């Protein structure tokens, strides 16, 4: 029973103590559901935290660290109980243990603590976790351990309210520059996921990522053999090209567009949807970037997805087309018309998602407005495919911005 175990772990007899802490560890590491609340309420936490000081019994330290690791894996209240019992400074101590498995378990427990949220992360950071953590990254570290280190790095990078301090980001980026050349898939996946978390934090963090020099190593992972790697990288570069035109061009200069035919035609619709969302952010760029997308022969693939894709992919392709009309030359828009964009574009006028409808009406209006003299020909094509009837029906929509734009388009 729990009473016996709690009483026994604070013992003078080294074998009963080890046995009792081992029993507690095993209680937390077996079934799909462990008794975490009963162990928290039993009072065992101070015994386990005390066990972390026992440099004379690395087996006891490992077992106690593992128990605490698994307690910290539960809800925020359970993780905070581990934190409130003063475990964090003791785990930071065990990062300098000569015993590898003890060190790895200390890393793992700290990973679970860091993962709970931004304030917990920032506490662990303020106590100095990052340098001893990144010091493990070396050619000789065993791979199971290196993987656990990289998972902790992901948890240092992923919370955004606030993001990790700039100085912490500055320490992690050189390590990611090292790890992105690893051949192990799980390490590569985590490294790239970390980059995707840094690149979603804002334009200054995007710039730091660019300045590390890693983007030319990141872009080619879009064609990696493992799909988990491809989609992590697709997220990371997609976030970079949400930045300025200058920032977007860094990604394009890495030949990013050469990787997209295999993403636009991928069997998995989620990959199609991500890739079209990337391209919509390229076509929102300057005229030279628009031309880069045209010249990569991606517009026909986009229009096909506009016509026959899943609704999420259709919505992003609608944005990519409309954004193309906003910041595009007359001749680039003419290329769109020649590729028969108009019918599949107008077919989205009837969907129940008003945001997509607004985007489409805006793009149709801009298309007609930019072709100063050819406006009659373009109006006739819109009529031919039923677009006029669709606009007339959109005059009765609930949404004022929609019905206003439909009236304005028909009048103008």
């Amino acid at each position: 029973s729990l009473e016996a175990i709690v009483q026994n772990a604070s013992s003078d007899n080294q074998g009963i103590q080890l046995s009792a802490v081992q029993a507690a560890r095993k209680l937390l590491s077996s079934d799909r559901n462990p008794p975490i609340d009963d162990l928290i309420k039993s009072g065992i936490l101070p015994i386990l935290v005390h066990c972390l000081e026992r440099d004379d019994n690395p087996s006891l330290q490992f077992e106690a660290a593992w128990a605490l690791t698994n307690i910290a894996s539960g809800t925020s209240e359970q993780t905070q109980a581990v934190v409130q019992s003063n475990a964090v400074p003791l785990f930071l101590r065990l990062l300098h243990s000569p015993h590898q498995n003890v060190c790895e378990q200390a890393v793992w427990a700290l990973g679970n603590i860091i993962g709970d949220g931004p304030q917990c992360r920032d506490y662990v950071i303020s106590l100095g976790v990052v340098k001893p953590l990144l010091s493990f990254i070396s050619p000789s570290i065993p791979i199971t351990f290196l993987r656990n280190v990289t998972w902790v790095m992901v948890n240092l990078c992923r919370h955004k309210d606030p993001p990790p301090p700039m100085e912490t980001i500055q320490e992690i980026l050189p390590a990611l520059c090292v790890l992105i050349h690893h051949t192990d898939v799980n390490i590569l996946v985590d490294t790239v996921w970390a980059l995707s978390y840094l690149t979603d934090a804002g334009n200054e963090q995007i710039q730091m990522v660019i300045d590390s020099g890693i983007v030319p190593h990141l872009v080619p992972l879009l064609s990696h053999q493992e799909v988990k790697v491809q989609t992590a990288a697709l997220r990371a570069v997609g976030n970079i090209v949400t930045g300025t035109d200058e920032q977007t061009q860094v990604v394009l200069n890495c030949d990013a567009l050469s990787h997209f035919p295999a993403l636009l035609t991928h069997p998995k619709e989620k990959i199609n949807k991500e890739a079209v969302w990337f391209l919509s952010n390229i076509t929102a760029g300057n005229q030279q970037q628009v031309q880069a997308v045209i010249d990569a022969n991606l517009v026909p693939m986009i229009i096909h997805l506009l016509d026959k894709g899943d609704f999420g992919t259709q919505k992003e392709a609608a944005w990519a087309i409309s954004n193309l009309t906003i910041s595009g030359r007359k001749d680039q828009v003419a290329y769109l018309i020649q590729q028969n964009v108009i019918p599949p574009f107008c077919n989205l006028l009837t969907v129940k998602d008003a945001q997509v409808v607004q985007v489409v009406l805006d793009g149709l209006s801009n298309i007609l407005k930019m072709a100063e003299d050819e406006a009659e020909t373009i109006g006739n094509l819109i009529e031919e495919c039923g677009g006029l009837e669709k606009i007339e029906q959109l005059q009765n929509h609930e949404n004022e911005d929609i019905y206003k734009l439909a009236y304005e388009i028909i009048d103008q």
Binding site: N70, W193, T242
Partner: peptide
């Protein structure tokens, strides 16, 4: 003209907490 940030789930994220077995 402007860029957008994604409006979907991204349910493939790596685990925040991991319980060792």
């Amino acid at each position: 003209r402007r860029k957008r940030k994604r409006e979907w789930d991204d349910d493939d994220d790596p685990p925040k907490k991991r319980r060792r077995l």
